[PDB]
Design a protein around this ligand. Structure first.
Ligand SMILES: [Ca+2]
Ligand SMILES: [Mg+2]
Ligand code: NA
Length: 327
DNA sequence: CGGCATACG
DNA sequence: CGTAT
DNA sequence: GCCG
């Protein structure tokens, strides 16, 4: 009744096992801080299974036969069901290692490997990093300066205003180019940590060289607080606020229209959904999927797609709208 | 046991 | 190394 | 950590 890959089942944004999935995602996060990508994946997948269930898990026996629930994840759920808390989870939550790796990796420009090295050097706080700024990249300096604003959720109300200003710059850069909202907001989220936009043009090839032209125009409008030929830009934008403004993370991606369905699919996520979809494609169908296309390595051919529906059909999967990709 | 998504800046 | 879903 |  529960298929093993997240791309084989609908996952809504809100569900019936929120507390259970949040606990498993703590353990997944902690596994990632320690470099165990395998354990991170299992805990993420187990969490995702619970999101896809039609009602709350109330008894341990309801986990029988669910994929990705073994001794460890089942014991976590058991303790939560019996006592309302899981000691392992609370131990992680309280730990200096978890709290500091979380704090450091949430800086734009800082990943697990950097955070871990800083942790091993004895650093613990944002002000610890500010006092030693020669150790920081320009990207990290921007992430640290803007860290407080970037920790405030972006609201869907914010997104429409940003999309309008991006469209104006895009339209001057290349008349006829389009901007599509992707990422979590396209899956129905009401808040987010950033805004993701996908840009293309209906005439194949006209999008070449577009992103620099867009970025230069946004920068001339004074809207870019930070940014790095290219096709992806990871920016910090100045977003108007009542009597002021706040910094917001915005990602811009350009794709040729031939690849647009693949880029839309990839950038709409969720992250776990796309990993599971690419895993399914390769392992179950022998096809190689990325945000550019879908390759048959036996015929050495790429699948043409005119829509996301095409891609799901190519892969033998029932279509899922973005709102059901919240794996 | 091997495998765990796949790319660009 | 960072970033993206 | 779990699947096949
Ligand atoms: Ca993003
Ligand atoms: Mg996003
Ligand atoms: Na980071």
């Amino acid at each position: 009744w529960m298929p093993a890959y997240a791309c084989q089942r609908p996952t809504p944004l809100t569900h019936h096992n929120t507390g259970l999935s949040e606990a498993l995602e703590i353990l997944a996060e902690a596994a990632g801080f320690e470099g165990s990508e395998g354990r991170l994946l299992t805990f993420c997948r187990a969490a995702s299974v619970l999101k896809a269930l039609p009602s709350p898990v109330t008894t341990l026996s309801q986990l029988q036969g669910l994929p990705h629930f073994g001794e460890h994840s089942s014991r976590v759920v058991q303790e939560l069901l019996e006592h309302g808390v899981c000691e392992e989870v609370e131990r992680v939550r309280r730990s200096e290692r978890y709290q500091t790796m979380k704090l450091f990796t949430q800086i734009f420009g800082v990943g697990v490997k950097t955070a871990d090295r800083w942790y091993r050097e004895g650093l613990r706080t944002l002000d610890d990093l500010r006092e030693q700024p020669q150790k920081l990249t320009q990207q990290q300096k921007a992430g640290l300066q803007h860290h407080q604003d970037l920790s405030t959720p972006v609201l869907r109300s914010d997104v429409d205003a940003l999309q309008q200003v991006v469209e104006e710059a895009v339209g001057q850069a290349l008349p006829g180019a389009t901007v599509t909202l992707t990422g979590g907001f396209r899956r129905g989220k009401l808040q987010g940590h950033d805004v993701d936009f996908l840009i293309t043009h209906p005439k194949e090839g006209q999008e070449a060289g577009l992103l620099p032209r867009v970025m230069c125009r946004l920068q001339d409008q004074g809207l870019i607080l930070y940014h790095q030929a290219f096709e992806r830009s990871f920016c910090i934008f100045r977003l108007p606020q009542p009597g002021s403004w706040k910094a917001v993370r915005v990602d811009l991606v350009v794709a040729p229209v031939s690849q647009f369905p693949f880029a839309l699919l990839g950038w709409t996520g969720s992250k776990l959904f796309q990993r599971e979809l690419r895993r399914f494609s390769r392992k179950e169908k022998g096809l190689w999927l990325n945000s550019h296309g879908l390759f048959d390595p036996e015929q050495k051919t790429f699948f043409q797609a005119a829509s996301e529906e095409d891609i799901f059909r190519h892969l033998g999967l029932e279509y899922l709208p973005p709102e059901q990709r919240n794996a």
